[PDB]
Amino acid sequence: ATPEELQAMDNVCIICREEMVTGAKRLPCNHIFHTSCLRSWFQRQQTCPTCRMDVL
Numbered sequence: 001a002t003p004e005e006l007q008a009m010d011n012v013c014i015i016c017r018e019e020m021v022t023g024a025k026r027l028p029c030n031h032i033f034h035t036s037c038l039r040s041w042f043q044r045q046q047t048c049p050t051c052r053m054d055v056l
């Protein structure tokens with residue numbers, strides 16, 4: 001992800017509602033989340049942790 005896109009969304013991972021300073025990806029829906037929270041989130045819920053919009 002980029003610093004401009006992260007700041008455009010509080011650069012905070014919703015999944016755990018913490019913070020994202022480095023080590024995360026960006027979804028095609030405009031929602032960045034921890035690279036660990038995602039792979040683990042989709043493993044149970046195939047929907048964005050915010051927009052729950054099919055991505056996989």
Ligand SMILES: [Zn+2]
Pocket residue numbers: 013014015016017018033034037
């Ligand atoms: Zn997280």
Ligand SMILES: [Zn+2]
Pocket residue numbers: 027029030031048049050051052053
């Ligand atoms: Zn989304």
